[PDB]
A paper describes a structure:
Typically, BMMFs encode an autonomous plasmid trans-acting replication initiator protein (Rep). Reps are composed of two winged-helix domains (termed WH1 and WH2) that are essentially a fused N- and C-terminal protein.
In this study, we determined the X-ray crystal structure of MSBI1.176 WH1 in the dimeric form to 1.53 Å resolution. The asymmetric unit consisted of one WH1 dimer, i.e. two protomers (termed A and B). The WH1 structure comprised five α-helices (α1–α5) and five β-strands (β1–β5) in each protomer. The A and B protomers were closely related (r.m.s.d. of 0.37 Å); however, a minor structural shift was observed at the β2–β3 hairpin, suggesting some flexibility of this region. Similar to that from RepA, the MSBI1.176 WH1 was also folded as the replication-inert dimer, while RepE (a WH1–2 construct) was crystallized in the monomeric initiator form. Superposition of MSBI1.176 WH1 and RepA WH1 showed that these two domains were structurally similar (r.m.s.d. of 1.20 Å), with both having the typical five α-helices and five β-strands. However, loop movements and different α-helices and β-strands have been observed among the different structures. In the case of MSBI1.176, the β2–β3 hairpin shifted approximately 23 Å when compared with the RepA β2–β3 hairpin. In the MSBI1.176 WH1 structure, six basic residues were also found in this region, i.e. Lys69, Lys73 (both located on α4), Lys85 (β2), Arg90 (β3), Arg78 and Arg96 (both on adjacent loops). The function of the MSBI1.176 WH1 β2–β3 sheet orientation is not obvious, although MSBI1.176 WH1 has a three-amino-acid insertion in the β2 strand that extended the sheet.
Residue numbers in the entry:
A (entry chain A): 2 to 132
B (entry chain B): 4 to 35, 40 to 136
The structure:
């Protein structure tokens, strides 16, 4: 089925993300829930370096730069898969995120997930959660 | 501040003509637009509207899709506590269907609110055709 194919393609592509990129995504999910924001293809999601520090106990002075650099690395990625259309099958290429942003003065970044990824965000949360 | 409209319209000058026409055709066929739903462009529409070689027209659109997907533009916004530096794609997703000679794009959310301005600029450029 289509959703199984896309899920498979995204999960296989997920292995290429660096740990900081996985944590950027996890943090966006966590902060969205915490501040009462849904995840969709239009609205930016904020990530605070302070949350990165609080969630993962990472070196504090490099946390914001790590997130800033992870945004750029994630923004460069793409994945491909096929979907059904009325008139046949379509060959799709998608980004992970359509937009990124950073605010140096507040140590925050912003991302918008691409629409193909939005329905699989809970699968990514599962894929990326470490115990 | 690097205002978004200025940055995007200046970035539009950098597109190849086929990419500009891909965007215009997507807008046209839609009328005949949001950050979630793909927009279809038929190579037959490209051929019918523009003075292009018909035998290579679909391939030209496929290549234009890939080039447009590779592009980015940047701008700034004022926020409460300071300035944010934003980088956006033109399209978040592309697709092609060889058997029907069609392509698909989804515009990135930063571009959606400027689509009418892009339509006007690209219509003015190609008004003779």
């Amino acid at each position: 089925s289509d959703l199984i194919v896309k899920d498979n393609a995204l999960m296989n592509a997920s292995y290429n993300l660096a740990l900081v990129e996985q944590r950027l995504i996890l943090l966006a999910i966590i902060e969205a829930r915490e501040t009462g924001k849904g995840i969709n293809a239009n609205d930016p999601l904020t990530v605070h370096a302070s949350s990165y520090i609080n969630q993962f106990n990472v070196e504090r002075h490099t946390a914001y730069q790590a997130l800033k650099d992870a945004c750029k690395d994630l923004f460069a990625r793409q994945f491909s898969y096929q979907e059904k259309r009325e008139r046949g099958r379509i060959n799709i290429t998608s980004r992970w995120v359509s937009q990124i942003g950073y605010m140096d003065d507040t140590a925050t970044v912003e991302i918008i997930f691409a629409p193909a990824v939005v329905p699989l965000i809970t699968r990514l949360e599962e894929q990326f959660t470490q115990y």
